[PDB]
Amino acid sequence: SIQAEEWYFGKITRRESERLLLNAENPRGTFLVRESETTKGAYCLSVSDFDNAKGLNVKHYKIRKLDSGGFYITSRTQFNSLQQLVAYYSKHADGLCHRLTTVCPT
Numbered sequence: 001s002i003q004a005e006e007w008y009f010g011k012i013t014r015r016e017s018e019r020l021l022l023n024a025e026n027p028r029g030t031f032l033v034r035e036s037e038t039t040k041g042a043y044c045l046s047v048s049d050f051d052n053a054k055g056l057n058v059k060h061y062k063i064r065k066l067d068s069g070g071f072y073i074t075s076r077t078q079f080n081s082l083q084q085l086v087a088y089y090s091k092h093a094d095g096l097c098h099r100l101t102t103v104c105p106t
């Protein structure tokens, strides 16, 4: 169960995920998974990034879950679980601003 996962912050807003992630000490790829504020049955993967242009900033990717069972940010790349998705994205940047590195501190 994802609710048991330490990177699962459940019902928090986008602003709040940005408040937690916009901390000077978070390295690129700090992340958390939360509920989508407006897309039901979707989660949101909030991820911190950093570059000399934008400085420290956050990106939000919608995680869809099919009734067919798979989870995904892009339908081309599916997984049997949220946990597997997270693990995959901890190893590949793909279309993300950065590979998942560290669970957003509280």
Ligand SMILES: N#Cc1ccc2cccc(OP(=O)(O)O)c2n1
Pocket: 013, 014, 035, 036, 037, 038, 039, 043, 044, 060, 062
């Ligand atoms: N599409 C879209 C879309 C566009 C703007 C959004 C603003 C706040 C929260 C949202 O949902 P989320 O970040 O997924 O919690 C949004 N979703």
